[model samples]
Target: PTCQLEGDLVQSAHHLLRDLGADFPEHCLPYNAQISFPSSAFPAATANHPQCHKSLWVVHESLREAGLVFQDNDIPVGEGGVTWNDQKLEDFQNLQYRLVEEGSCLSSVNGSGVLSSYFSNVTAVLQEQDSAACGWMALRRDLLWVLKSALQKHRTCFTWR
Candidate 1:
């Protein structure tokens, strides 16, 4: 499970945690074989594991309870938190031809080239988890805004005529 989270996505998560005064180990973020795996409830450190795809999930799990996780089609939970009702990540991971265009495709791989764009779109569904109206729903709306920011960079690229 390589780190599926966009680089900045993880960075923003760190800032969010820091802003909230949440405790975590930053050393494990750029996940590697050399560092010991994190055991904190929110392993925000593992956001960059080279062979870990659960990065997004771990990051999301950390903040989901706060209604700050990314969910493409999230609905109200309690009074402030939100929850996703669809397979947002799945839909975007294999970004369909109809969605991207006839010659382009988005894949798990990073960076863009002949066949497809990178997983850079991890941010698309990252707007409060894919357009939840930009910090309007979450209790820590400000925190989510700061976190959602990382999703803005590293956009999925398109390669075609």
Candidate 2:
């Protein structure tokens, strides 16, 4: 019922994809990414974390703006072993720390212990990459897989909503 989106338009994972269905929303953090200021490190908003949900907004925007829609069978590509530049890693970490300070709430339960675990795990996962480039590729590869799963579940067959 679940598939790992291959890491290449054309590849793989040092860490295998963890196939979580709709529940993926509960596991993600908001970079709170934006197209305008890709480098902005302001407090990010996530679907599950920090008392807000924006994954649906992200999916809708990706569809309208980029014309991207993940059908029931559509799959996205992930690129593995792709590392982030030192600057990229540093930038990402800086933002991450800021967000952590802002705090996160998940599954209707929020606690310092839970938040700490989440932060520690995410930091460790990204930092412990074998590649010197901070495992950018690996992170992206898995991220695409996560995105695909989320999109497939929430996406509707509407071009204009």
Deviation of model 1 at 102, angstroms = 22
Q: What's the TM for model 1?
A: 0.23
**Which candidate has the highest TM-score of all?**
2
What is the Cα-based TM-score of model 2? 0.26
Residue 150, candidate 2: Cα error in Å is: 1.3
Task: For model 2, name the residue pairs that clash.
Answer: 7-78, 8-11, 50-104, 50-105, 82-137
Poorest 10 consecutive residues of model 1 by lDDT? 112-121
Off by over 4 Å in 1: 1-4, 20-50, 68-161
Question: What's the C-alpha lDDT at position 103 in model 1?
Answer: 19
Q: Model-by-model lDDT, in order?
A: 0.30, 0.28
Cα lDDT of model 1 by residue, 13-61, tens digit: 4343334322223332332221221323222333343322232333333
Question: Clashes in each model (backbone N, CA, C under 3 Å)?
Answer: 11, 5
